[PDB]
Amino acid sequence: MTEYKLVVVGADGVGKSALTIQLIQNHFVDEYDPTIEDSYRKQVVIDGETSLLDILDTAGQEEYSAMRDQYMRTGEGFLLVFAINNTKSFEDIHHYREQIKRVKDSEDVPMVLVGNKSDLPSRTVDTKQAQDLARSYGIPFIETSAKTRQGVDDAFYTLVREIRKHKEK
């Protein structure tokens, strides 16, 4: 009966929707509407536990209404997504992590840093940069390609494992 509320955050264009749709539908959607914030639930078995993952794929205007703080605060774990070919997207990770900490009122929120578009040759964020950042935050780092599905399950399932560890602290 276990359910996990997950939220996928990060800059426009990093592949949040492509990652979400790989998990939900098992294919690469090349051009999912860039403006649309939507959610999807999927039943999975992770380490033998049947789970319902209820995933919010964020999008749309930058706004900070009380309603948005309220529903964002119900997230139990967050994927911090950047793209390895886009330094600006990596530089935005700090902001998303701070907004999560702000609404959850905690220094300890389950998160995973996700470096997407790992299939692309035009790398401008080194793996070491991402590892150093994740280490500084105390969280895992997972390299993904929504295009090929590399790492997708690992990113979501690692986030579930982080939530489990948080629950038992």
Ligand X SMILES: Nc1nc2c(ncn2[C@@H]2O[C@H](COP(=O)(O)OP(=O)(O)O)[C@@H](O)[C@H]2O)c(=O)[nH]1
Please give the residue ranges that form the binding site for ligand 7L8 (CB under 6 A).
5, 7, 9, 11-12, 39, 54, 56, 58-60, 62, 64, 67-72, 74-75, 92, 95-96, 99-100, 103
Question: One-letter amino acid identity for 34?
Answer: P
Decide if 7 contacts 79 (C-beta within 8 A). yes
Task: Return the bridge partners of 80, or none.
Answer: 9, 113
Q: Which does 54 bind (CB under 5 to 8 A by kind): ligand 7L8, Mg ion, ligand X, none?
A: ligand 7L8
Q: Using the minimum distance from each CB to Mg ion, give the nearer residue, 51 or 58.
A: 58
Q: Where are the beta strands (DSSP E) in 10-88?
A: 38-46, 49-57, 77-83
Among 24, 44, 46, 59, binds Mg ion (CB under 5 A): 59
The torsion defined by the Cα of 19, 60, 51 and 29, in degrees rounded to 10, comes to -30
Note the residues at the interface with ligand X (CB under 6 A).
Answer: 12-18, 30-32, 34, 116-117, 119-120, 145-147
Note the residues at the interface with Mg ion (CB under 5 A).
Answer: 16-17, 59
